[PDB]
Scaffold this active site. Structure first.
Site, mmCIF file in Angstrom:
data_model
loop_
_atom_site.group_PDB
_atom_site.id
_atom_site.type_symbol
_atom_site.label_atom_id
_atom_site.label_comp_id
_atom_site.label_asym_id
_atom_site.label_seq_id
_atom_site.Cartn_x
_atom_site.Cartn_y
_atom_site.Cartn_z
ATOM 1 N N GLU A 1 43.545 44.317 37.273
ATOM 2 C CA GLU A 1 43.555 43.748 38.622
ATOM 3 C C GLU A 1 44.992 43.298 38.869
ATOM 4 O O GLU A 1 45.918 44.101 38.677
ATOM 5 C CB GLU A 1 42.487 42.682 38.772
ATOM 6 C CG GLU A 1 41.076 43.226 38.709
ATOM 7 C CD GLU A 1 40.783 44.230 39.805
ATOM 8 O OE1 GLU A 1 41.359 44.106 40.904
ATOM 9 O OE2 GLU A 1 39.972 45.150 39.564
ATOM 10 N N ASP A 2 45.235 42.062 39.272
ATOM 11 C CA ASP A 2 46.585 41.629 39.575
ATOM 12 C C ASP A 2 47.225 40.804 38.467
ATOM 13 O O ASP A 2 48.350 40.335 38.645
ATOM 14 C CB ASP A 2 46.594 40.838 40.881
ATOM 15 C CG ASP A 2 46.321 41.711 42.085
ATOM 16 O OD1 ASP A 2 46.187 42.939 41.907
ATOM 17 O OD2 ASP A 2 46.242 41.173 43.210
#
Ligand SMILES: [Mg+2]
Ligand SMILES: [Zn+2]
Ligand SMILES: [Zn+2]
Ligand SMILES: [Zn+2]
Ligand SMILES: [Zn+2]
Ligand SMILES: [Zn+2]
Lengths: 576, 525, 49, 44, 93, 98, 82, 67, 115, 257, 87
Positions: free
Chosen positions: B155-156
Site C-alpha cells: 500500500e503506501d
RNA sequence: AAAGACCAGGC
DNA sequence: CAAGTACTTACGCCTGGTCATT
C-alpha cells in the site's frame, strides 16, 4: 432550548441514542503485516494492557485466572479487576492488596486482552458490512495496528496515516456472535455483487504474475524455503517438472500446493489474445494464458487480477464456494507468504527505465501528435470558411468541438497504443498493468506518450480570459495547445500552459471528490433509514416493522446473495 | 544587458528592484489589465522570428516558475507530476518537520517540533533560495529504494532502515509548553504556587509531587513522566484544593526550561517546556516532496536491508506500486538527479520549466559516473546474500518527516470518565474518551444481524441505567431502594412498579420530552 | 490617549524595524522571521486576506 | 531558590511571594537554573 | 438484483410511489420512535403526543433506543432451556 | 479591547454580534515549519460558505495565472476557497486618485 | 403452534447458531453441566462448539412466525450448517 | 543542525570532515574535489557534507541564558 | 512507547529456551527446530550446510515474524539418519569451516603485512 | 556431507580497509560473515551519559547521542571487557565499562569547538579515534558543557554505535554467469571492478552447472577496530554462536533422549 | 430493586395533563423562587431544589437515596399565573 | 477544571 | 385552485489549539 437538544447529528436521538460513544474501544495507526493471517489484527501491548475482558472464574480456570491476578496490572498478561458476585469490584492496580486476590467460582477477572481474543475492526467510513469485521488479536511490538493486505480492500484502507477502531466484545454471547457472524473468513464473498471482497492485492499479485510463467524455474533450496511458508503443506516435496540435468521446479508446480483441495477453474489472463480460443493452440496457449486449474493443480496460465482478484469466478471465489471459509483463509495467507518470500529473490522495482521508450517510439508519438495538430488546424480552417455542415442534433460550434475532441482523443489513443506496444517484456509499468496490482493503460500512455486533453466541466479549458485561455495566446485560438491539449508526456515534462491546464483538471477532480461525499453519505443514510427494519421472517417472507409483506420470498427466489453465481442458460440462445 | 550588469553588482551600486521598475523595464500588471496584454512565456523562444504566431507582444514573463506559490515551489520537477500530487505536497510541506525558526530556544510555544539534522535538498528549485528553505530545511535526503522487499512497504507504507534511525536519522524533539497563572478571584479565595504537602490540600491526585521545588515549579533537567506534577498550585477554599498541572498521558519527557514572570495583571505566571526526543518508530509518517506519503511499515537493520555492491543500503524503501497509478514522476527524476548530484558534487537544479535539464541528459551524466543511466543498481538480499533478480531503482530523494506520529494518535479506552450530562464516555483522546459508535456502525451491525453486539455497544459499553416505571402509567416512579419504598405519585401506586434497564441517553430523552409536555409512557404490559 | 493599536511585527512602527541581524539576535528574534503577524495576549495572529 | 534573569543573566535569589524582579536589570522575566539532581541519558 | 428489488419494492409497495425521504419514510404507518430518528425528531414526537400515537416497539431503532434486543438476527428468536436434555448424557458438575 | 478581541478570537466585528460576524480571519500563525509560516502569512480566503455544493467557485480560474498558486489549496470542504499567493504576486496598497 | 405442523426451515440459521453458542458458553462459564465429554478444554466457547457438533445442547429455539405463533425447535433437531 | 557524525546509510564518520570541507571549499576546490580530498567515495557519505546546513552558527549568535 | 528494548533479539530472558525440537507427524523422521533469539545469520548458514548433506531430503528455515526473534528449521533426513544428527553434524561442519577460514585469514594477514 | 574448505586471499590491507576474496565457500556462509561484520562484532561505545552542565544550543539528549556515535578504539580491551549484563558489579565497574570525562567552558570570544579530543578517558587503550577530531558541539562565550560517561561493550544488533564497519562491499559473480540477476539490456550496465570479461562482450555465458563462490569483500573500519580485527572477531563470534547453539542442542537431545 | 426487571413492550405518547403534572411533581406549591441558592445551600422552591434531584456529587436527595447515580432526577412544576401557548 | 464557539489538520 | 410564502435538510470518524463565560 429543549428542541435543539433533541435534533439531528450532535442532538440526542442521533448523537446519544442511535449512535453513542463506547467503552472497550481503541484506535491507532494501521500498518501492513503480510505475516499475520487474514483473520488477525496486530495490537500493541499498551492497547492490550489497557483493554480488559471479564472472564468468569470457573473451576476449570481458577488456576490460570489466579496467576493472572497475581501478575497485577503491571505485567501485561495480567488483570485489572476482580468482580465478586455481589457486584463489588476490587482493583488490582492500586497496591498489591494481598487479601483481595482470592478467587472462587462465579467471580469475574478482568484480564488484559490476549492473543486469540475476537475483536471488531472498523474503518470509520462504514459503508458495507465488510467494513466492521471480526479479527483475532495477535500482540506485536511497536504502537501501531497491523492488518493483512488482502483485508485492505474491504476496509478501503491504505497505510498512509490511516487509523482504525478496535472494539472488544466483553460478554461470551457477543464474542460468539462476532465469531460466528462477522469473522473475516466468513465475509470473503459479499452479497452485494456475489463476488469476493478480498483479493490478492499489491506486491503479492505482481509477484504471482511473475512467479507463474514458464520462465520461472526454481532450484531445490528455493523450493524448500518457499514450502516452509505453506501452512497447508502436507510435507511432501513434489517431483520437479525438470529432473536429471538439474532438478528444477516450476512456479506453477509450487502454486499447485497452495491451491486448496481439488479446485477446478478456467480463467483468461489479461493479455490473452482474442484469436487463441478460435484458432488452434486453444489448449496449448503459446503466451501461457488461459489459466486452467484441475484437481487443485495449476495446469497452465499466468495468474493476475482476473484469477486471484475480486471478480466473479476468481480462484479465491471458487475456493470459498467449494472448500470453505477456513481453507480459503489459509489460501490467502499462504499465497501471500510464499509469494513474498519468492519476491525476496526475484524483486520488483519502478524507475525511469520503465518510463522511457525507444527513440523510434518517441518519433512515432511525436509524428502522431503533429498529424493530429495538423488535422485540427485543418478543421479550424474549414470551420472558419464555413465549410462544415452542422451535424444533426448539434449546432456548428458543438460539431466543431466534437471534431476537435475526436481528433485529439484518437491521437491520444494511437499514441498510447504505440507506447504500450513499445514496452519491454521486463517493464515494471507493464508488469504492474498486466498484473492489475496498480495501474492502467492510460497511465503508461501519459507517462510515455501524451498526457492528453484536459477538460474542465466536461468541455475543454474554458475561455476564462476575454476570448483567450491565457494571456500568452491570441484571441479565438481553438488550437490544441490553447484550449487544453497537453502534448508533452509526463516524463517529457509539461510546459507552463500545459501545467496550468493540468492544475485545472486535477482541481476539478478534487472538487468532485470533496463535494460528492456529503450527498452520497446523505443518500446512504436515507436508504438505510428507509429499510433498516426490513428482514426475512421465519416464514421466508420479507416484512417491515409493521409486518407488511414487502417480498413474498426474499429476492423473489428466497436465496441469499453470497452463494449465487453467474451461469449460462444453454437453452435460451441456440436455434431449433 | 546593462540592467543585469548593474544588478550583478547589486552591492556597492545602490541598484535595486525599484530602480529596475523606475527605468521602465518591468511593470506591474493586475488581473484585468492582463486581458489587454499579450504575454511571452520566455523571450528566447517567442520574441524571435519564426513561423510567426504573435508579432504584437506587450509584456514578457520573468520566469514561469513564479506561478507556483511558496509551498509548491519546494517540489522538484513539479511539471512532471500529476497535479493532485502537487496539491498533496503543498498540503504536506506545511506539516513537514524541521527548524521552524532559529530562536526556538527562547520561545515557549505549544507543539514545537524541531528536527535534529535537517538537510538541504540535493535536487533543489531556484525559488527555494528566496523562501529561505536552504537556511531552515524541513527534511533530509534518504537513499530511497523503489523496491518490494518484504511486503512491509505495501500500500503506501515505507520500510525505514533501523540503523539510520539509530544513527540520528529523522530524529526530532517535541517541545510542549505548559502555562499556569496565579490569580486572586474571591475575597479569601487565592491561588498560589506552592508545593502541596501530603495533608494540607483537600483535593489531591495519585501523582508524585516530589519533583516540585519549594516554589511549586520543577527545575529543568527533571525527568517528568506521565501524570507527574509540573507546576504545583492550590486554591485556598473558603483547607486548600489542588489545581496543579499534570502532564499528558504517556509522554516521558525531560524539562527544558521553566520561566517565571508577571502577566498583564501583575500575578505570578509560569511557563514550563518539556522536550521528548521522538525517535522514528514504525507508526510515524514520512512523505516525499511529491505527495508520496506513508507510515513506516517496519524498521529493518542494516544487515537485513538490501545492499549494493558498494554497501549503500537504502534508508527508506518505498513501494513500486505507489508510483504508476498516481504517475508521480518528479520522484523518479528527483532520485536520478540526486544520484547524479551527490556523485558530481553540486546541488542539482529542479526548476520546473528549464528545457535544458532532460531525463536523457541526467541519465548520461549518471552513466559518466559508473552507474546505470536509469539509476538502477544491482541489489543483494540481506537475508540470503543472493542478488535480487530484478534491479532496484536506488537514489537519494529528499524525504520529510511529518508531524503525524503514532504516539500522538494511539488511544485505548476501558471504563474511563463519563460526561456530566449524557453519562457516556467523554469525547477525545486527552479526556480518556471512547471511540464513537455512530449511526453507520449500527447500520453495518444490523446488516450483520448482530443484535447482541449492537446492544452491548449501545447499552452496556456506554451508559447503562436502571429506572423504575409505574405499570398503570408509564411515567417513571420514585424509587428509594434502601428503604424499598417505590412510590408513583399521580396514581398513589406503591406496588405495581417494574424495573426497566434503558440507556441513560434514553432516560434523558424521555425527561427532556416531559419538560416539553410530551409524556413518553413506557408500558410493560 | 484613546486606545492601543496592535502593531504588526516588522512593520514600520515595530521596534524591530530597520534593525540588522545582529540587533535582532540581541533581541532574541530570528532574522529570518518574516514578520507580518500581530501578537495578541501572547499568541501570534495572522490576518488572512 | 535562585532565578537567572532573562536579560542580564545575573542570578538573583528571589524569595517566594516576592515580585519577580531582576535586581540591577529591571527585567520581569526570570528562569530556573537546572536542578543538581542528575539523570541518565542512554546514548542510544 | 435482490437489493434493487428490495429498494424498488419498499418504494412501490404501499400503493403509491414512496420517496426515500422524510416524506415517505416519515409518512408510513411505522412508529413514532422510528420516524423520530430520521430528519424530524421533535415534530414527530409532538404529533404523537397530540394524537396519542402508540409505538409497539417492533422495529430496530425503537429497541436500540431503549437498549433492548432488537428483532434483528440473533434477536428474532427467544431461546428456552430444555429440561429433559439436561438429564440425558454425562454431566460432571 | 475591540481590536484585541477581533484579532484574538477571529470573529470580525463587535463582541455582541459574534454570530453575525465574519469568522476565520485572524488565525494563529502555525509555526510547525518555516514553509507553513510563510504560507500562512500569504493566504487568501474566499468568504463563501464552505458547505456550498456548487463547483464553480472552487475551480481554478484562468485568471489566477501568476497571482495564486495553481496547486496549493487545502483538501476537504475548503478546497479552492482557501488559496495561496504566487511568488511574484503583490497586492496594491492604495493611492488617492487625485 | 404445537409440536406438529412445524412449517419452517429444518436448517439452523447462522444467527441461531451464534446465539445458541453464546448462551451455552455463558451457561458453561456459569458452572452449568457439560453434556458431552471434554478432552481437557477450558474455553467455554470451545466446549459449546463441541456440544453443538455432538448435538447435545439443552436449548430450544423459539422461532416466532410473523402471525404471532411460535415454533419450538430443539437444537438437536436442527441440522448444523457447518 | 550540527554536522551529523556517522553518515546514516553506511556509518563512516562525516562529523570531523565539516570544518575541513569548509576550509577546502573556501580556499580553492570545487565541492566534488573537496569531497574527494576528504575521502568520501560513496555518494551516501557525500550527501552528508554536501547537503548539510550548519545551523549551529545561527544558534550561537544568540546570547546565552546565563553568562 | 511500545518499543521493545533493543536487547530483545539476542538476549534470552528468564524461562525460554534457546533450542526446541518437535517431531512433525505428517512425514517420517522430519523434525522442527525452534531457535529463540536468533535470525537469518544462523538460519541461512545452517540450511545451506544441511543441504550439503546427501542424507537430508528436506532442509529449510524461516523467521515466523520479523518483529519476533525466532527461527524454525525443518529437517527431514533419510531413514537411518536422524534430523537431530543432521543438525549437530551441520553445526560441527560450520564450526570446522570457520576454524579453517580463520586460520587461513590469519595466514593471509600475516603474509600481507610486512610479507 | 561435510564442510567446504575456504581459501582467502587479501588484495588490499590499509588502516581502514581490507579487500579480500573468499573461495570454495557457500553463499550463505559468506553472507553470514558479512552480517556478523555489521551486526555481531563487539566494540566499546559510550552508552551512559550523565550531564552536570549543558549550556550548549544542542540539548542533553542530542549531545548524548552525538557522544554515543563517537568511535572509541576498542582494538584490544574489547575481548577482555565483560558485558555489563554479565558483570558482577551493579552499575559499572572498570572491567565492564570505560569512564570518560568532558569539561569545556568557552571563555574566549571565538567559538570553542567541543570535539572528541576533549573526551578524557581513563583506559589508555580506548581513545576516541585520535592517535581531524569528531565535533561534539560548538560553544560561545560563557557557555559550558561538562559530562561524565561510561562506555560499555556491545554489538551492532543492540545499536548502530557498536557497528564496527562503514560500507562492507559484498559482491559475487561480477561477470554475470549464474544469471542471478537478469539484466534487461545487458550492454548498458557498468563492468564490475572484478570483471574478467572482454569489453565487447556484455555478460559471461550462462553456466548451468555453476554455483556462487569466490565472494569479494571490502571491509571498511570506522576507526574503532582495524579491518583485520573486524573480520577475525566476526569469524570468532559466528563460531561462538554456533558452538553455543550446538551446546544447547546437545543439552536438549540429552534431556529429551 | 425489588421490582421485577420488565422490558418495554410499547411506548404510548401523550400530553401531560396539568393534574398529572401537579401530582407527579415532587415540589409542593410549585417552584416560586428564582434564586438557585440563598446561603450557599440549595433553597427549597428554587431552581436547584434538593427534592428535585441530587447535587454536590456526594449527597443524597430528599426524595430517595440519590448517590447522584441512583436518582433519575424528579420533576418539578411551575404554576403559571396566566396560561400560555405551547409553541 | 467544564461545555459552547471558532480555527487548523488527518483518513 | 391556482397563485403566491415558509421549513427542513444537506458523509462518517478522528487530532491539536484558542477564547470567552462559569
Ligand atoms: Mg488512506
Ligand atoms: Zn403511576
Ligand atoms: Zn537582569
Ligand atoms: Zn556513507
Ligand atoms: Zn563491572
Ligand atoms: Zn431522588
Amino acid at each position: 432550548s429543549l428542541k435543539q437538544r433533541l435534533k439531528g447529528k450532535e442532538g440526542r436521538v442521533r448523537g446519544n441514542l442511535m449512535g453513542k460513544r463506547v467503552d472497550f474501544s481503541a484506535r491507532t495507526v494501521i500498518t501492513p503485516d503480510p505475516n499475520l493471517s487474514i483473520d488477525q489484527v496486530g495490537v500493541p501491548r499498551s492497547i492490550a494492557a489497557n483493554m480488559t475482558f471479564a472472564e468468569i472464574v470457573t473451576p476449570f480456570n481458577i488456576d490460570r485466572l489466579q496467576e493472572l491476578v497475581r501478575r497485577g496490572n503491571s505485567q501485561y498478561p495480567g488483570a485489572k479487576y476482580i468482580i465478586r458476585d455481589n457486584g463489588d469490584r476490587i482493583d488490582l492496580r492500586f497496591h498489591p492488596k494481598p487479601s483481595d486476590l482470592h478467587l472462587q467460582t462465579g467471580y469475574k477477572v478482568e484480564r488484559h486482552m490476549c492473543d486469540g481474543d475476537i475483536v471488531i475492526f472498523n474503518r470509520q467510513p462504514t459503508l458495507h458490512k465488510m467494513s466492521m469485521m471480526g479479527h483475532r488479536v495477535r500482540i506485536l511490538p511497536w504502537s501501531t495496528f497491523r492488518l493483512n493486505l488482502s483485508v485492505t480492500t474491504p476496509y478501503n484502507a491504505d497505510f498512509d496515516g490511516d487509523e482504525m477502531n478496535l472494539h472488544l466484545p466483553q460478554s461470551l454471547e457477543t464474542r460468539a456472535e462476532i465469531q460466528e457472524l462477522a469473522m473475516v473468513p466468513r465475509m470473503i464473498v459479499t452479497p452485494q455483487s456475489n463476488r469476493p471482497v478480498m483479493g490478492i492485492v499489491q506486491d503479492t499479485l505482481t509477484a504471482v504474475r511473475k512467479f507463474t510463467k514458464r520462465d520461472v524455474f526454481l532450484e531445490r533450496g528455493e523450493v524448500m524455503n518457499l514450502l516452509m511458508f505453506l501452512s497447508t503443506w502436507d510435507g511432501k516435496v513434489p517431483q520437479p517438472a525438470i529432473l536429471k540435468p538439474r532438478p528444477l521446479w516450476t512456479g506453477k508446480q509450487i502454486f499447485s500446493l497452495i491451491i486448496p483441495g481439488h479446485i477446478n477453474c478456467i480463467r483468461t489472463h489479461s493479455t490473452h489474445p482474442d484469436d487463441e480460443d478460435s484458432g488452434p493452440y486453444k489448449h496449448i496457449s503459446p503466451g501461457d494464458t488461459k489459466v486452467v486449474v484441475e484437481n487443485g493443480e495449476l495446469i497452465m496460465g499466468i495468474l493476475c487480477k482476473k484469477s486471484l482478484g475480486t471478480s466473479a469466478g476468481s480462484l479465491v471465489h471458487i475456493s470459498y464456494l467449494e472448500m470453505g471459509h477456513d481453507i480459503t483463509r489459509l489460501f490467502y495467507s499462504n499465497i501471500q507468504t510464499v509469494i513474498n518470500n519468492w519476491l525476496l529473490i526475484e524483486g520488483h522495482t519502478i524507475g525511469i527505465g520503465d518510463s522511457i521508450a525507444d527513440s523510434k517510439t518517441y518519433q512515432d508519438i511525436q509524428n502522431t501528435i503533429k498529424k493530429a495538430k495538423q488535422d485540427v488546424i485543418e478543421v479550424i480552417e474549414k470551420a472558419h470558411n464555413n465549410e462544415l455542415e452542422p451535424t444533426p442534433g448539434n449546432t456548428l460550434r458543438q460539431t466543431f468541438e466534437n471534431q476537435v475532441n475526436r481528433i485529439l482523443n484518437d491521437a491520444r489513443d494511437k499514441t498510447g497504443s504505440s507506447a504500450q506496444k513499445s514496452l519491454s517484456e521486463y517493464n515494471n509499468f507493464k508488469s504492474m498493468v498486466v498484473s492489475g496490482a496498480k495501474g492502467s493503460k492510460i497511465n503508461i500512455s501519459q507517462v510515455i506518450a501524451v498526457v492528453g486533453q484536459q477538460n474542465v466541466e466536461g468541455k475543454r479549458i474554458p475561455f476564462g480570459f476575454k476570448h483567450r485561455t491565457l494571456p500568452h495566446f491570441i484571441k479565438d485560438d481553438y488550437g490544441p495547445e490553447s484550449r487544453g491539449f497537453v502534448e508533452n508526456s509526463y516524463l517529457a515534462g509539461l510546459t507552463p500552459t500545459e501545467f496550468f491546464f493540468h492544475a485545472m483538471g486535477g482541481r476539478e477532480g478534487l472538487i468532485d471528490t470533496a463535494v460528492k461525499t456529503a450527498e452520497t453519505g446523505y443518500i446512504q443514510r436515507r436508504l438505510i433509514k428507509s429499510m433498516e427494519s426490513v428482514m426475512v421472517k421465519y416464514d421466508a417472507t420479507v416484512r417491515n416493522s409493521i409486518n407488511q409483506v414487502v417480498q413474498l420470498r426474499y429476492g423473489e427466489d428466497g436465496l441469499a446473495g453470497e452463494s449465487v453465481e453467474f451461469q449460462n442458460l444453454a437453452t435460451l440462445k441456440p436455434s431449433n | 544587458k546593462r540592467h543585469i550588469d548593474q544588478l550583478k553588482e547589486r552591492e556597492y551600486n545602490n541598484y535595486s528592484w525599484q530602480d529596475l521598475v523606475a527605468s521602465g523595464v518591468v511593470e506591474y500588471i493586475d488581473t484585468l489589465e492582463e486581458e489587454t496584454v499579450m504575454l511571452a512565456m520566455t523571450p528566447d523562444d517567442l520574441q524571435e522570428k519564426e513561423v510567426a504566431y504573435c508579432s504584437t507582444y506587450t509584456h514578457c514573463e520573468i520566469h514561469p516558475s513564479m506561478i507556483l506559490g511558496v509551498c509548491a515551489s519546494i517540489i522538484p520537477f513539479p511539471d512532471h507530476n500529476q497535479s493532485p500530487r502537487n496539491t498533496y505536497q503543498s498540503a504536506m510541506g506545511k506539516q513537514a518537520m524541521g527548524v521552524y525558526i532559529t530562536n526556538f530556544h527562547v520561545r515557549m510555544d505549544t507543539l514545537a517540533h524541531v528536527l535534529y539534522y535537517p538537510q538541504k535538498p540535493l535536487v533543489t528549485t531556484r525559488s527555494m533560495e528566496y523562501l529561505r528553505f536552504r537556511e531552515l530545511p524541513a527534511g533530509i535526503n534518504s537513499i530511497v529504494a523503489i523496491a518490494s522487499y518484504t511486503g512491509y512497504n505495501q500500500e503506501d507504507s515505507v520500510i525505514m532502515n533501523r540503523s539510520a534511525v539509530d544513527r540520528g536519522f529523522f530524529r526530532s524533539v517535541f517541545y510542549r509548553s505548559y502555562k499556569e497563572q496565579e490569580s486572586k478571584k474571591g475575597f479569601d479565595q487565592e491561588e498560589v504556587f506552592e508545593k502541596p504537602t501530603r495533608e494540607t490540600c483537600q483535593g489531591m491526585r495519585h501523582a508524585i509531587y516530589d519533583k516540585l521545588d519549594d516554589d511549586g515549579l520543577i527545575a529543568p533537567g527533571v525527568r517528568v513522566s506521565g501524570d507527574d506534577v509540573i507546576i504545583g498550585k492550590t486554591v485556598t477554599l473558603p483547607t486548600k484544593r489542588d489545581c496543579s498541572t499534570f502532564l499528558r498521558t504517556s509522554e516521558t519527557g525531560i524539562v527544558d526550561q521553566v520561566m517565571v514572570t508577571l502577566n498583564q495583571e501583575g500575578y505570578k505566571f509560569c511557563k514550563i517546556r518539556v522536550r521528548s526526543v521522538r525517535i522514528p518508530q514504525i507508526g510515524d509518517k514520512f512523505a516525499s516532496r511529491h505527495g508520496q506519503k506513508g507510515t513506516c511499515g517496519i524498521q529493518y537493520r542494516q544487515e537485513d536491508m538490501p545492499f549494493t555492491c558498494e554497501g549503500i543500503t537504502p534508508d527508506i524503501i518505498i513501494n513500486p506500486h505507489a508510483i504508476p497509478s498516481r504517475m508521480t514522476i518528479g520522484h523518479l527524476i528527483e532520485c536520478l538527479q540526486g544520484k547524479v548530484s551527490a556523485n558530481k558534487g553540486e546541488i542539482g537544479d529542479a526548476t520546473p520549466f528549464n528545457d535544458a535539464v532532460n531525463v536523457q541528459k541526467i541519465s548520461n551524466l549518471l552513466s559518466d559516473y559508473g552507474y546505470h543511466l536509469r539509476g538502477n543498481e544491482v541489489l543483494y538480499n540481506g537475508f540470503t546474500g543472493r542478488k535480487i533478480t530484478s534491479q532496484i531503482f536506488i537514489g537519494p530523494t529528499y524525504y520529510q518527516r511529518l508531524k503525524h506520529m503514532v504516539d500522538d494518535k494511539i488511544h485505548s479506552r476501558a471504563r474511563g470518565p463519563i460526561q456530566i450530562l449524557n453519562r457516556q464516555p467523554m469525547e477525545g483522546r486527552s479526556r480518556d474518551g471512547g471511540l464513537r459508535f455512530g449511526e453507520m456502525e449500527r447500520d453495518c451491525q444490523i446488516a450483520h444481524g448482530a443484535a447482541q453486539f449492537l446492544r452491548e455497544r449501545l447499552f452496556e459499553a456506554s451508559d447503562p441505567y436502571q429506572v423504575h416505571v409505574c405499570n398503570l402509567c408509564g411515567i417513571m416512579a420514585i424509587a428509594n431502594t434502601r428503604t424499598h419504598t417505590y412510590e408513583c405519585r399521580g396514581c398513589r401506586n406503591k406496588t405495581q412498579i417494574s424495573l426497566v434497564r434503558m440507556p441513560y441517553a434514553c432516560k434523558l430523552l424521555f425527561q427532556e420530552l416531559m419538560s416539553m409536555s410530551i409524556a413518553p409512557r413506557m408500558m410493560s404490559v | 490617549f484613546i486606545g492601543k493599536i496592535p502593531i504588526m511585527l516588522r512593520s514600520t512602527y515595530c521596534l524591530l524595524n530597520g534593525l540588522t541581524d545582529r540587533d535582532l539576535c540581541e533581541l532574541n528574534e530570528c532574522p529570518l522571521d518574516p514578520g507580518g503577524y500581530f501578537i495578541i495576549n501572547g499568541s501570534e495572529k495572522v490576518l488572512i486576506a | 531558590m535562585i532565578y537567572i534573569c532573562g536579560e542580564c543573566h545575573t542570578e538573583n535569589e528571589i524569595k517566594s511571594r516576592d515580585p519577580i524582579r531582576c535586581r540591577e536589570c529591571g527585567y520581569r522575566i526570570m528562569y530556573k537554573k537546572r536542578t543538581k539532581r542528575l539523570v541518565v541519558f542512554d546514548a542510544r | 438484483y435482490r437489493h434493487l428489488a428490495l429498494l424498488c419494492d419498499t418504494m412501490t409497495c404501499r400503493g403509491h410511489l414512496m420517496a426515500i425521504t422524510r416524506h415517505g419514510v416519515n409518512r408510513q404507518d411505522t412508529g413514532p420512535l422510528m420516524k423520530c430518528s430520521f430528519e424530524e425528531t421533535v415534530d414527530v414526537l409532538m404529533e404523537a403526543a397530540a394524537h396519542g400515537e402508540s409505538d409497539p416497539m417492533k422495529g430496530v431503532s425503537e429497541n436500540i433506543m431503549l437498549g433492548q434486543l432488537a428483532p434483528a438476527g440473533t434477536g428474532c428468536f427467544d431461546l428456552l432451556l430444555d429440561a429433559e436434555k439436561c438429564k440425558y448424557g454425562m454431566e460432571i458438575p | 479591547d475591540g481590536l484585541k478581541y477581533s484579532l484574538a478570537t477571529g470573529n470580525w466585528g463587535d463582541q455582541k454580534k459574534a454570530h453575525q460576524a465574519r469568522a476565520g480571519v485572524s488565525q494563529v500563525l502555525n509555526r510547525l515549519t518555516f514553509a507553513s509560516t510563510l504560507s500562512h502569512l500569504r493566504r487568501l480566503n474566499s468568504p463563501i460558505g464552505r458547505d456550498g455544493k456548487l463547483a464553480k467557485p472552487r475551480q481554478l480560474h484562468n485568471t489566477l495565472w501568476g497571482m495564486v498558486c495553481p496547486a496549493e489549496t487545502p483538501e476537504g470542504h475548503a478546497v479552492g476557497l482557501v488559496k495561496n499567493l504566487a511568488l511574484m504576486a503583490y497586492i496594491s496598497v492604495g493611492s488617492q486618485p487625485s | 403452534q404445537a409440536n406438529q405442523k412445524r412449517i419452517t426451515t429444518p436448517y439452523m440459521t447462522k444467527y441461531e447458531r451464534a446465539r445458541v453458542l453464546g448462551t451455552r458458553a455463558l451457561q458453561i462459564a456459569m458452572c452449568a453441566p457439560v453434556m458431552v465429554e471434554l478432552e481437557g478444554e477450558t474455553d467455554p466457547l470451545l466446549i459449546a462448539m463441541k456440544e453443538l457438533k455432538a448435538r447435545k445442547i439443552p436449548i430450544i429455539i423459539r422461532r416466532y412466525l410473523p402471525d404471532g405463533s411460535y415454533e419450538d425447535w430443539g437444537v438437536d433437531e436442527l441440522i448444523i450448517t457447518d | 543542525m550540527i554536522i551529523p557524525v556517522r553518515c546514516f546509510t553506511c556509518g563512516k564518520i562525516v562529523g570531523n570532515k565539516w570544518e575541513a570541507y569548509l576550509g577546502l571549499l573556501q580556499a580553492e576546490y570545487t565541492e566534488g574535489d573537496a569531497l574527494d580530498a576528504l575521502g568520501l567515495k560513496r555518494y551516501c557519505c557525500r550527501r552528508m557534507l554536501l547537503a548539510h546546513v550548519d545551523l549551529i552558527e545561527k544558534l550561537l549568535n544568540y546570547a546565552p541564558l546565563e553568562k | 512507547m511500545n518499543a521493545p528494548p533493543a536487547f530483545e533479539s539476542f538476549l534470552l530472558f528468564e524461562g525460554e529456551k534457546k533450542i526446541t525440537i518437535n517431531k512433525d507427524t505428517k512425514v517420517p523422521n522430519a523434525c522442527l527446530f525452534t531457535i529463540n533469539k536468533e535470525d537469518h545469520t544462523l538460519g541461512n548458514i545452517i540450511k545451506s550446510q544441511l543441504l550439503k548433506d546427501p542424507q537430508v531430503l528436506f532442509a529449510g528455515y524461516k523467521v515466523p515474524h520479523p518483529l519476533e526473534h525466532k527461527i524454525i528449521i525443518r529437517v527431514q533426513t533419510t531413514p537411518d539418519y536422524s534430523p537431530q544428527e543432521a543438525f549437530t553434524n551441520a553445526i560441527t561442519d560450520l564450526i570446522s569451516e570457520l576454524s579453517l577460514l580463520e586460520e587461513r585469514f590469519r595466514v593471509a594477514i600475516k603474509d600481507k603485512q610486512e610479507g | 556431507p561435510y564442510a567446504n574448505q575456504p581459501t582467502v586471499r587479501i588484495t588490499e590491507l590499509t588502516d581502514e580497509n581490507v579487500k579480500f576474496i573468499i573461495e570454495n565457500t557457500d553463499l550463505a556462509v559468506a553472507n553470514s560473515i558479512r552480517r556478523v561484520f555489521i551486526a555481531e562484532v563487539p566494540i566499546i561505545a559510550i552508552d551512559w551519559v550523565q550531564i552536570d552542565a549543558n549550556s550548549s544550543v544542542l540539548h542533553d539528549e542530542f549531545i548524548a547521542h552525538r557522544l554515543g556515535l563517537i568511535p572509541l578504539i576498542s582494538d584490544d580491551i574489547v575481548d577482555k571487557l565483560q558485558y555489563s549484563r554479565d558483570c558482577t558489579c551493579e552499575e559499572f565497574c572498570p572491567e565492564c565499562s570505560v569512564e570518560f570525562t568532558l569539561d569545556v567552558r568557552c571563555n574566549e570570544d571565538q567559538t570553542r569547538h567541543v570535539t572528541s579530543r576533549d573526551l578524557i578517558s581513563n583506559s589508555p587503550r580506548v581513545i576516541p579515534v585520535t592517535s581531524d577530531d569528531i565535533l561534539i558541539v560548538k560553544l560561545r562565550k560563557g557557555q559550558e558543557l561538562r559530562l561524565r560517561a561510561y562506555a560499555k561493550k556491545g554489538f551492532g544488533k543492540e545499536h548502530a554505535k557498536w557497528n564496527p564497519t562503514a560500507g562492507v562491499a559484498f559482491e559475487y559473480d561480477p561477470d554475470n554467469a549464474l544469471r542471478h540477476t537478469v539484466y534487461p539490456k545487458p550492454e548498458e550496465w557498468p563492468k564490475s571492478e572484478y570483471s574478467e570479461l572482454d569489453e565487447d562482450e556484455s555478460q559471461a555465458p550462462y553456466d548451468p552447472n555453476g554455483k556462487p563462490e569466490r565472494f569479494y569483500y571490502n571491509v571498511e573500519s570506522c576507526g574503532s577496530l582495524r579491518p583485520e580485527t573486524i573480520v577475525l572477531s566476526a569469524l570468532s563470534g559466528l563460531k561462538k554462536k554456533l558452538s553455543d547453539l550446538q551446546t544447547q542442542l546437545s543439552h536438549e537431545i540429552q534431556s529429551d533422549v | 430493586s425489588a421490582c421485577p426487571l420488565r422490558t418495554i413492550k410499547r411506548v404510548q405518547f401523550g400530553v401531560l395533563s396539568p393534574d398529572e403534572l401537579k401530582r407527579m411533581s415532587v415540589t409542593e406549591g410549585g417552584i416560586k423562587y428564582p434564586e438557585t441558592t440563598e446561603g450557599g445551600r440549595p433553597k427549597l422552591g428554587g431552581l436547584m431544589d434538593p427534592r428535585q434531584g441530587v447535587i454536590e456529587r456526594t449527597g443524597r436527595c430528599q426524595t430517595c437515596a440519590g448517590n447522584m447515580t441512583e436518582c433519575p432526577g424528579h420533576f418539578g412544576h411551575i404554576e403559571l399565573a396566566k396560561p400560555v401557548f405551547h409553541v
